[PDB]
């Protein structure tokens, strides 16, 4: 029996709303108070357990503030005590809260001068106690207060009210004193993290984040401001638990899983995140329990009151209040679950983002080749990111069922067993829905594959720009460009567009029609009357139903996703390891000369065992002496390399002892370059030293290479290593070598693959004995007979096997064959850019999108008139006994869901259709018409690679995102609009509650939309290098070895990891503060409308459907509100992409393709004219007046940095005049049509070009010439038979595009073939400095005189060898000019400069 004495027994609930004294007393004080005692006591012992002394804190008026309110609040326990004792006190429960709570007292006094002492963080069980207490002593003055109120007595007495309201006071004004208060400790690199020292309120409500929030918001963000990682978050330590424990699975385990090792490292935050989910699902469905509590009890007090013991209407009060705590409870443990989850995302990420890279490190040579570069690159850069991403959802496959299983229980419970036609719709639904998400994905794939076409027909367009320009084929190819477009992908577009509205019809109709169809079997089965409060709590569980059922399957996805990336991560873990024996390694001798440095005892060396045990090193006796050069010789592929790894320990030993002394130096057999510095890739971590450091790049010989290069050593090799070449690159790799100074060198061919001069220059000071590093060891495999002298020992190896070995007088003697032989923005913080979506909406047709709007309106409306109409069916079945008209209320229901998704069907094909692929459509066609119509200075100052980003990855956004974003953004705006209004139309005085919470609404979104935008842009900065590094590691994977500086390289990645997480753990944890922000609003909503709603209960005037229809409505904000949020940071973060789009589309252009002064189907003359190639740059031609005849076969000469390669850009207009003009037979230039003028003309460029598809379209693609005509120029080039051969198609052969298939001269014909093909009554000639080989080279000398006999021939070339033939002359003097005839009547007179050469 209840060991308790009074008429409200421990029943938690009294038959007021609020709990009784009882409960009060005897569970939620007493349960604070001994959990104040265990753990108090526990925490006062950890902090005098945990350290002697710790830093101590100034014990300012905080710590005697708080000190005093534990006195005060003590003294009102025991005058508690005191003063009940007398009334009937032997009621167990008030004297067991006096003894709990006094024992608490003492406690807690204690623990507050200890936890001010010794701790930072305001200690987490003294915030929960009095939030507790003052919780418990709340509950006991809103008891009193209400059995005084409603009784008229006084349970405890005029001075146990008013003793208990002291209490409040004082356990309110205690915590606040305790959480609020920052701690004085009375005593660049980036601030240690608030999380550390966040109490644990903080910690619940992520309010440590709000420092960081605002410095976003007032300014833009970069690493400097990112807080450093909370302690825990190192990638090193999280490496080593997660390694430690793999390698437990490894070797103390038969069956090693990284499944479970992954699980018994990371394991016991994702339990606690799912305990937090638990409690978050058993909250979410009390919650609509607490609608159907309170409709029921309106519906009671209502008839009660119209028309003993009536309902307090106090109860209303009270469940309005569960309501709200409730829905904070809820937002508080949902997001500490999401905290959770996410961190151990964040924790499998860098612990295998980090294992991954010091297992690449040691990953055996076979091994390392077996793997693609790319596949292992993968391994972390999509597998690990599917172990992070299944953390997220590992909870859903019990929360999943956990959160079905209690939805259907509360369904059956209240709406009887029709329930099961609403489950069994949304099941039917989850095939259908499954299989457009996969119909969604085919189309989505098949746009991406689309946009990959396009990316590829703009990047030869713009790469090779300047030839097509130069060609005038403009048009053509834009044509193609837009035949591309607009057939393959934006119809591909519309079809997703269609889909995408079939989903949308969907994903609006089935929680419509599951609540239709079982509202309909209740009414046509169940003798109850469908009440008021049976609809509306059943429409709010089928909300919530929705999301399991949606859920699960995706979670399945993503589980065998999960699993499979782990099983490729289990086969990378165990993948084989180089032996660490290979080669043992000893320190360096003091001694000189005498000692072996390096040992082979007749040792032999497999390339591998398990994928093939077949191939090695033989047994091989080697040597090498200290501070000489010994040397390798053999034919290539012969074991030269292999035998190099060796010491480097690459090849596995299986016999015979080797042996290398001290650090080493190696030298790849293809040099490796390290993106960064050119300094960084000298010093390669080794301190610098200057003295040695020029000394040294001068003994490389490549000073000269840093005098070229725009900013020398400190110039940045560029991505991928593409910014140099090999001939710098032997050299680099070489000087590296040399500056590491190390106790040994092992050189595979580190000069082989440079020029003779080169080669000497590098012997004669660095391997020679008088070079810089005699010393130390070389051992160097090569075969040239200039660096063989220097050998002190050389070992000739055929097939693996060292044929002789010896020093250079011993191979002289050997007489054998080779023996005989060898001797952006600033970072304020400007608004938004609305004009740019005004743009956008110019770009949509300004009317379809109002029709979108519109019919949004339309399908929310109806919605909500469907919810009305509802509310009127319940109220006339709850006004009658049972259903009247079942088939007209239903009818009607029906007819207004029906409408709704109608309404959301249109929106969504007015959407894809009329707005969002119209605006597509013309963003594009106008961009493309701005950027090809461009002047080259547009394409010279601009990356390529932006450019083609614009095109690529931009308009792709626009063309796909951004339409849902705006359409997800505006159906979510309508949608809190109108559940605004519907809970205002309850209530009007609603609105006085909704404008602060507008207001505070609209603060935090602000702030979220800034730091968000900043953090998801630094995140992706930040993510890129640590793949980068880790394929360049991959790459460069044996000469990190070589060094032994995988020890850099594994720190390097590990700081390429943290900065990623500074970079991530605000960006979640943005997330979180800015959804229990929203969350808590979504909760004072509900408290407002509740409450709202039982005040006009009390003032009579409320019907239950009123309050239903409000609350079911305000129940749904809490979601919406955050999903508005998100939307407006999204379509910010793709709207830069209309900006980017825009910012080309206006781009200012050259002159008029066409213009009245036609050429109506040659000679020309320059009179004064003058350009320069850049607008800022001086002139590159100056006063030019030459005159050409119709037919002279002229050519040009000049200084290097003269205009004379500018001359060709400036005959086509390609840069403009800037005085003075150029006339043709009988018309300026100037005013000419630039396609008149640019097709008239005929050229071939200074370097050819390829495009992708047949020859045709590179010889012909507007096919304006005849079929005739271009047979004809294939026969004049004689390319025919190539083509021929190439494939049958002959002149329409196929080509492929961008790779080697041609060698230049062959492009240079075709051009040839181009140009004789086009009519022309002018021929422009050019040819740089190429590797042409003089066959095809000379071929084209004959047959441009074959092109055209008779045509002014403009031969601009770098070769005077092409030049000789020429019968007039120019010389270009840096926009100075002389002309001459024939180079003999040129020479006749001086001996030019050109005559020097010649």
Request: glycine share 6%.
């Amino acid at each position: 029996c209840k060991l308790c004495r009074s008429p409200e027994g421990f029943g938690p609930i009294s038959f007021y709303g609020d709990f009784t004294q009882c409960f009060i007393d005897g569970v939620i004080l007493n349960l604070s108070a001994i959990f104040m005692i265990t753990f108090g006591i526990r925490d006062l012992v950890n902090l005098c357990k945990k350290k002697h002394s710790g830093i101590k804190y100034r014990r300012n008026w905080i710590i005697v503030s708080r000190m005093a309110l534990v006195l005060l609040e003590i003294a009102f326990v025991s005058l508690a005590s005191l003063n009940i004792s007398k009334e009937e006190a032997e009621n167990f429960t008030i004297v067991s809260q006096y003894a709990s709570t006094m024992l608490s007292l003492f406690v807690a006094l204690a623990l507050h001068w200890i936890e001010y002492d010794r701790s930072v963080v305001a200690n987490t069980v003294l915030l929960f106690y009095w939030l507790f207490e003052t919780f418990g002593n709340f509950a006991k003055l809103i008891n009193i207060l209400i059995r005084h109120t409603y009784e008229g007595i006084w349970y405890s007495g005029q001075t146990g009210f008013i003793l208990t309201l002291f209490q409040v006071i004082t356990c309110a004004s205690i915590l606040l004193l305790e959480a609020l208060p920052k701690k004085p400790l009375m005593p660049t690199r980036r601030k240690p993290n608030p999380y550390d020292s966040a109490n644990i309120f903080s910690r619940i409500t992520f309010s440590w984040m709000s420092g960081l929030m605002k410095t976003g918001y007032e300014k833009y963000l970069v690493e400097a401001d990112l807080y450093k990682l909370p302690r825990n978050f190192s990638s090193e330590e999280l490496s080593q638990k997660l390694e430690k424990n793999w390698e437990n699975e490894l070797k103390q385990k038969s069956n090693p899983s990284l499944s479970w090792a992954i699980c018994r490292t990371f394991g016991s935050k994702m339990l606690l995140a799912a305990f937090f989910k638990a409690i978050h699902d058993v909250l979410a469905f009390t919650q609509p329990q607490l609608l159907r509590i309170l409709i029921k009890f309106v519906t009671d007090y209502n008839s009660e009151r119209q028309d003993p013991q009536k309902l307090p209407i106090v109860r209303g009060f009270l469940i309005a209040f569960a309501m709200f705590l409730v829905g904070f409870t809820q937002t508080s443990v949902l997001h500490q679950y999401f905290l959770n989850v996410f961190n151990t995302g964040m924790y499998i990420k860098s612990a295998l983002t980090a294992l991954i890279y010091q297992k690449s490190l040691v990953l055996s040579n076979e091994a390392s080749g077996l793997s693609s570069t790319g596949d292992i690159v993968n391994l972390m850069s999509v597998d690990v990111q599917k172990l992070q991403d299944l953390t997220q959802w590992l909870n859903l496959i019990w929360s999943g069922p956990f959160q079905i299983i209690i939805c259907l229980y509360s369904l059956y419970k209240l709406l009887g067993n029709s329930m099961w036609v609403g489950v069994i719709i949304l099941v039917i639904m989850m095939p259908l829905n499954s299989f457009l998400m996969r119909i969604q994905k085919k189309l989505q794939k098949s746009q991406m594959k689309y946009k990959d076409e396009r990316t590829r027909v703009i990047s030869e367009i713009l790469n090779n720009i300047k030839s097509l320009k130069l060609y005038a084929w403009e048009k053509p190819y834009r044509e193609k460009l837009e035949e591309v477009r607009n057939n393959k992908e934006l119809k591909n577009l519309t079809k997703l567009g269609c889909y995408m509205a079939v989903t949308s019809f969907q994903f609006n109709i089935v929680p419509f029609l599951v609540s239709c169809c079982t509202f309909a079997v209740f009414v046509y089965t169940e003798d109850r009357a469908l009440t008021t409060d049976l609809v509306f709590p059943a429409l709010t569980l089928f909300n919530l139903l929705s999301f399991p059922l949606m859920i699960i399957p995706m979670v399945l996805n993503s589980f065998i996703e999960a699993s499979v990336s782990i099983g490729r991560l289990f086969t990378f873990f165990t993948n084989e390891e180089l032996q660490p024996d290979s080669v043992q390694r000893l320190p360096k001798v003091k001694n000189i000369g005498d000692v072996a440095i390096n040992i082979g005892d007749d040792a032999t060396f497999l390339w591998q065992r398990k994928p093939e045990y077949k191939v090695a090193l033989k047994n091989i006796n080697f040597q090498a002496k200290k501070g000489n050069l010994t040397c390798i010789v053999g034919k290539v592929g012969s074991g030269k390399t292999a035998l190099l790894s060796c010491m480097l320990g690459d090849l596995f030993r299986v016999k015979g002892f080797a042996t290398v002394h001290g650090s080493v130096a190696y030298v790849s057999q293809v040099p490796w370059i390290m993106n960064g510095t050119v300094k960084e890739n000298i010093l390669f971590g080794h301190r610098y030293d200057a003295e040695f450091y020029e000394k040294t790049i001068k003994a490389c010989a490549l000073t000269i290479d840093l005098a070229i290069l725009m900013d020398g050593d400190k110039t940045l090799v560029g991505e991928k290593g593409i910014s140099l070449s090999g001939g710098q690159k032997a050299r680099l790799s070489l000087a590296r070598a040399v500056y590491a100074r190390a106790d040994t060198y092992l050189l595979d061919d580190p000069l082989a693959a440079v020029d003779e001069h080169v080669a000497r220059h590098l012997i004669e000071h660095v391997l020679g004995p008088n070079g810089l590093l005699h010393t130390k060891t070389k051992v160097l495999a090569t075969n040239k007979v200039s660096a063989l002298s220097i050998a002190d020992s050389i070992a000739l190896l055929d097939n693996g096997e060292i044929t002789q070995q010896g020093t250079y007088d011993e191979i002289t003697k050997d007489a054998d064959s080779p023996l005989w032989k060898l001797l952006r923005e600033h970072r304020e913080q400007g608004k938004v850019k609305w004009n740019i979506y005004l743009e956008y909406a110019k770009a949509c047709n300004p009317k379809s999108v109002c029709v979108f709007i519109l019919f949004i309106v339309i399908s929310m409306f109806l919605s909500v008139m469907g919810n009305v109409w509802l509310k009127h069916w319940s109220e006339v079945n709850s006004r009658y006994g049972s259903n009247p008209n079942a088939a007209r209320y239903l009818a009607i229901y029906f007819a207004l869901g029906i409408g709704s998704a109608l309404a959301t069907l249109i929106q969504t094909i007015v959407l894809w259709v009329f707005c969002t692929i119209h605006a597509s459509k013309y963003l594009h066609n106008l961009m493309t018409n701005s950027v090809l119509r461009a002047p080259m200075t547009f394409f010279e100052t601009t990356p390529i690679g932006r450019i083609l980003n614009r095109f690529s990855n931009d308009i792709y956004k626009v063309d796909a995102l951004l339409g849902r974003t705006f359409s997800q953004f505006f159906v979510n705006a309508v949608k809190v609009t109108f559940t605004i209004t519907v809970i205002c139309a309850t209530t009007w005085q609603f609105i006085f509650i909704i404008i602060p919470l507008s207001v505070f609404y609209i603060y935090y979104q602000q702030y979220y939309l800034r730091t968000s935008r900043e953090l998801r842009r630094l995140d992706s900065i930040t993510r890129s290098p640590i793949y980068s590094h880790f394929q360049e590691t991959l790459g460069g994977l044996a000469t990190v070895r070589g060094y032994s500086q995988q020890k850099r390289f594994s720190h390097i990645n590990q700081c390429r990891i943290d900065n990623n997480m500074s970079a991530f753990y605000p960006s979640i944890n943005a997330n979180r503060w800015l959804a229990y922000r929203l969350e808590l609003i979504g909760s004072i909503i509900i408290l407002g409308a509740a409450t709202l709603s039982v005040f006009r209960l009390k003032q009579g005037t409320l019907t239950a459907g009123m309050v239903g229809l409000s609350l079911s409505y305000a129940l749904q904000i809490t979601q919406t509100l955050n999903w508005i949020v998100r939307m407006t940071v999204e379509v910010e973060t793709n709207i830069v992409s209309v900006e980017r789009i825009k910012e080309y589309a206006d781009l200012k252009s050259e002159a008029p393709l066409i213009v009245e002064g036609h050429r109506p189907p040659g000679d020309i003359k320059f009179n004064n004219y003058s350009t320069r190639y850049r607008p800022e740059l001086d002139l590159v031609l100056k006063h030019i007046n030459i005159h050409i005849k119709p037919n002279e076969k002229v050519g040009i000469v000049g200084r290097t940095g003269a205009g004379k390669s500018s001359l060709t850009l400036a005959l086509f207009r390609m840069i403009e005049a800037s005085e003075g003009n150029i006339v043709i037979d009988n018309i300026a230039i100037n005013e000419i049509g630039l396609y008149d003028l640019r097709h008239k003309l005929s050229i071939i460029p200074q370097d050819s070009q390829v495009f992708e598809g047949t020859v045709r379209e590179n010889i012909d693609p507007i096919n304006q010439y005849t079929d005739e005509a271009i047979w004809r120029a294939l026969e004049l080039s004689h390319l025919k038979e190539h083509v021929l051969s190439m494939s049958n198609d002959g002149l329409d052969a196929q080509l492929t595009e961008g790779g080697g298939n041609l060698s230049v001269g062959q492009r240079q014909l075709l051009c040839l073939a181009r140009a004789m093909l086009v009519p022309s009554k002018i021929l422009v000639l050019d040819e740089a400095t190429a590797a042409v080989d003089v066959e095809t080279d000379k071929v084209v000398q004959e047959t441009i005189r074959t092109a055209f006999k008779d045509r002014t021939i403009l031969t601009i070339a770098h070769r005077l060898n092409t030049i000789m033939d020429s019968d007039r002359i120019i010389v270009l003097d840096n926009g100075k000019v002389a002309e001459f005839d024939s180079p003999g009547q040129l020479l006749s007179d001086n001996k030019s400069l050109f005559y020097s050469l010649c």
